[PDB]
Design a protein around this nucleic acid. Sequence first.
DNA 1: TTGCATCGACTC
DNA 2: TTGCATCGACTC
DNA 3: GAGTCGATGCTTTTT
DNA 4: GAGTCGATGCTTTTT
Lengths: 274, 258, 260, 270, 93, 92
Amino acid sequence: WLPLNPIPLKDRVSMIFLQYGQIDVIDGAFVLIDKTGIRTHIPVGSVACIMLEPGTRVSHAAVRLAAQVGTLLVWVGEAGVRVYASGQPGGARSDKLLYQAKLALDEDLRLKVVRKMFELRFGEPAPARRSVEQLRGIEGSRVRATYALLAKQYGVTWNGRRYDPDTINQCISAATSCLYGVTEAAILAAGYAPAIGFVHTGKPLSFVYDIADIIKFDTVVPKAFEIARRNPGEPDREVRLACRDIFRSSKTLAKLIPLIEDVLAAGEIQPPAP
Amino acid sequence: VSMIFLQYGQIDVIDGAFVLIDKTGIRTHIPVGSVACIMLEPGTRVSHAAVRLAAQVGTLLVWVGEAGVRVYASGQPGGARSDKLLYQAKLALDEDLRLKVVRKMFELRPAPARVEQLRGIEGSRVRATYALLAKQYGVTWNGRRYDPGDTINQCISAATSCLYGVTEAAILAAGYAPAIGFVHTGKPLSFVYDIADIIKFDTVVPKAFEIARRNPGEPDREVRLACRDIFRSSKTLAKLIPLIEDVLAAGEIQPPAP
Amino acid sequence: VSMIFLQYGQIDVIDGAFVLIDKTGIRTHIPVGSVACIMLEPGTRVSHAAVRLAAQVGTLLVWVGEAGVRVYASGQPGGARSDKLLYQAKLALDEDLRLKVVRKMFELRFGEPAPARSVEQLRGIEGSRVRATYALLAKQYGVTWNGRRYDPGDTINQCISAATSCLYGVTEAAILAAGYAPAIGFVHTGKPLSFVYDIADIIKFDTVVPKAFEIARRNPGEPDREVRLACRDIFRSSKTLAKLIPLIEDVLAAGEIQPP
Amino acid sequence: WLPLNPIPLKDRVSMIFLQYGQIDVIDGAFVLIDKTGIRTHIPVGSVACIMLEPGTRVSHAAVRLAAQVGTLLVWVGEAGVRVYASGQPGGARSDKLLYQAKLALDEDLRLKVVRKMFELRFGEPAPARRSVEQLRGIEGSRVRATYALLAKQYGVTWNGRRYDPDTINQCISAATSCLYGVTEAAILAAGYAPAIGFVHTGKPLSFVYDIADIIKFDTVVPKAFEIARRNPGEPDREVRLACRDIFRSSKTLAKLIPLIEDVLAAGEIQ
Amino acid sequence: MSMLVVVTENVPPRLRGRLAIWLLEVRAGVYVGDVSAKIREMIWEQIAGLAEEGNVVMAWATNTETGFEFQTFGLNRRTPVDLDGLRLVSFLP
Amino acid sequence: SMLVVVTENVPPRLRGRLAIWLLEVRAGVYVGDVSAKIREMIWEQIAGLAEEGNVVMAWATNTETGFEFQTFGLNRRTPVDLDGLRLVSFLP
DNA sequence: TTGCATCGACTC
DNA sequence: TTGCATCGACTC
DNA sequence: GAGTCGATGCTTTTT
DNA sequence: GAGTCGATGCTTTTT
């Protein structure tokens, strides 16, 4: 017996959370094992991202198998954001990564890309003859205004974007954590590098933040506010389930790759074929 | 630059430091910050805490086979350090810098004053080298053949597979992208082939011939094990990083600091 | 009018005639045209040829339990003879013909002409008299009787219910053999076996119910089997099915309308 | 263990043909048994009509079970039409059958019904002040014209409607056989009596012919001609499969009951 | 109307055949069909009523998150389990 | 579209591999929801790894019966054609 | 006194 | 000289 | 089929 | 689960 390949991200469930057990390989399958000896088969190849919560212990084999089927593993903390990840050793095509690099390296192409990013964000072309930093400024302003608007809309006390080494900020942060998950998954599936960004740069998930930022507020943040409305003991779960529901309902996984391609396309340079 | 191999145990945390655990208790203490990169070999399991700590200090975890003879996975997918990758990209794009790297590569492996012709000369020598090792070790050699072969070609193929393993490991540990190559390009391991090719014939291939000789119960196993032992014993992975840095340095362009 | 019961064998064809076959060979020859209606009891199988022949001579096949104690299926679904059914329909529709049938039914049931004045009061008289009859049989046979009860009961009520079920079986058989529709009744209406209840009711208490009391008596291993078997034996032995057809014809005849 | 009920005809496959074996009950299920001892489970409750071909032998139990789930059994001959049938002992409601009888018995309501039947056939209301017989004349004429037209359309030599104690006539006859099958099934499921017809009368399948006749030519006959075009050794099968395909594709089973109700409704009665 | 699968284990012959009134048996204890909601539920009522000491699982295609849903009747080592609204299967030891 | 796969006496390799993409609700019975291409690659997996065991796969379609199925290897229960309807014959 | 089918119990 | 996981063979 | 508990071997190669 | 081969009983009621 020989072969094994990844399946398209399109066909997958967005993401699944595992907690308190060890994840092993049993007869070529990915399995969660409880303290009482409960096995639980997990269709790893049918998920874009697996989120490992505290108290989880991952076998070498499990990670190797998860990589072979092109599923991203992401270690997440006490209700926390993304802490770490493991995946496929790299982009499947040199051409794609190099394409991303050209676009990134020369400031004019970069300008074109960011402007498209802005357009996609707001439904409006960005003002003419403005540098990268200034567009950054407009973003920041507009974003603040948007948090204020959702707070207003949903009747939520909002005291700014604030972060913890407050309910509202945790809901937002967890939601974004999930979105950075899927966005990273897509970026890797597409064969590009998460570290090479256009707006954000110099950080390991720059491109992930760039892409996630585009669809963050039509998708994932509104419900963060709505859930924030409720004041429950354990927010996280409801947020997770709601994000699952939004990703399926709004076709997120399917759309993510096209969006990335169109974004990079705006460089007016030719993409390598799939 | 510092890296450690851990095997047959679980990696966890004690007082904010990395620790390897078996039934005998603690095998190895590693104080946080002492190491840039941890290579996890078969028979291992990773605690949540260990990953959270490794992230906190930005330590790279890389899942590999014994001694890095294969690479299965890496943390920080697609490289964690944007600057290094971009350095590699700059070098790769500019046809002239590229020339200049490839020429250095050749020197390390001085090249004739003109990329493709160098490709040709390499092919020729390489054949001559196979002929020489065949001669040296008394091995029937009937040319380059590989369809998915003869014993000798299987041993060679397996050894190279393994060398691509460790070379990839080094490339990822150094924080560069395996897909962006200079001689070879357009394919996922181009840079890995570039670097592996340089030190292929010092150690990895000769043993392939010696084992081919001995005509064993199983070559692929023995070849792989022999390469494992050589890579560990002769510090291959560690020594691969300087070579890479020098190669890219040759571009005469400002490397990023550490 | 002619009909035959076949049991424990396969029905096939020999030289254009019906034949019943066992492990013992031919058990019954039936020359084509000798019989209007064939009643197939449990343990039987039907050859293709047998059905094709039965169709050729327009013979009605009816799948039943032993002696017709239940009816499971019939050929020529919904009646084969339009005229008979339509005759039944006329009679059923007209207020007045209906009155007259029901009155005849009542007469036939007692040997007494029904009281002069509507259908509903006769319904009432019947209910009363019926109660009195249960009381009488209970008396005659020495049986504790505590009234009409039937949630989906007591021993006596189960025996009665099973017997009536079986009687509805044979009555249905007869109604279908005669070529009429069980759903079109005169006393009872609006339900699938109305006419069956109408006709069964007439001869319920001569034979079927008395045995229900006697069996209720003897308090068996238990009731329903024995009641059903006893009714089987009575229906076969006393030619009940055959005798049911004249009664039906006379009842409908009473409409004073041209039978086909 | 106790209960069992019929399922709606709507949900069923139109019909299935069985040949050369015995049909028995095994553990409460309907089973075809071959000479070599092959069992074959048949979802009887999931079919509106089972067609029994020559060489078939039917257990008592099988028929009783087929009746309980409201599936009509129909015995069919050497490529022949309907020869016999067995089903549920009768209509489930007295009311429906009596409704049918009223409509049938008085000639004026009957007139209304036949008119609607005609309308449904041709996409046109029938001419005013015409008796039943005259309408049946018009039918006969148009029908003939329609056979001529399909013959023309498909390039088929047509020498009239002719019955055998010629390919074209067999295809037609087999197709109609199937349709009379499903139509009868529907009529019984609806709780009405096949013998009480409006156009045709005095015959055991009068109402079946009445109803089948309405949709016969938009549905089942055209392909009889197309298949007739081909000159194969054994027509029957292809005709059967094509009729299966037409019944599913054109939602026949689902439509049959509504059509019947609307037809009888035209009496302007409860 | 949607695809249905039913899997029985150690169930009496009554049910074994009864499912076979409406469904097709492609292997022992495994039935496949295509039914409306109401029919699915009546089948379920059949199973719920006749499953003795055996156990059975039923799944059908839906337009929900995973694409389908399922329930069991009686006890089995393999049992459904909820992970944040995703329904998977836990293998009891 | 909905997919079901049923295996018998098949090696553990396949037992687990199907479990990479599918859910095991009983022994040897897998259920999922997949595109055509994935269904076919799964089939290729099965066709490649089924040894002496046998397996049957069925999925929902927009055809006459509503679904369609195939087997690999030998079983007493085998598909059979009745005028374009596909049913199952039980051998002896 | 014949037969079809469900239900047992004991080894594949 | 430590370990995770596949593959055997022999009884539930 | 699914437990065990011994066996083995961290491997399904190629530029 | 799926063969057998003995046992039983043609039956799951109601107007």
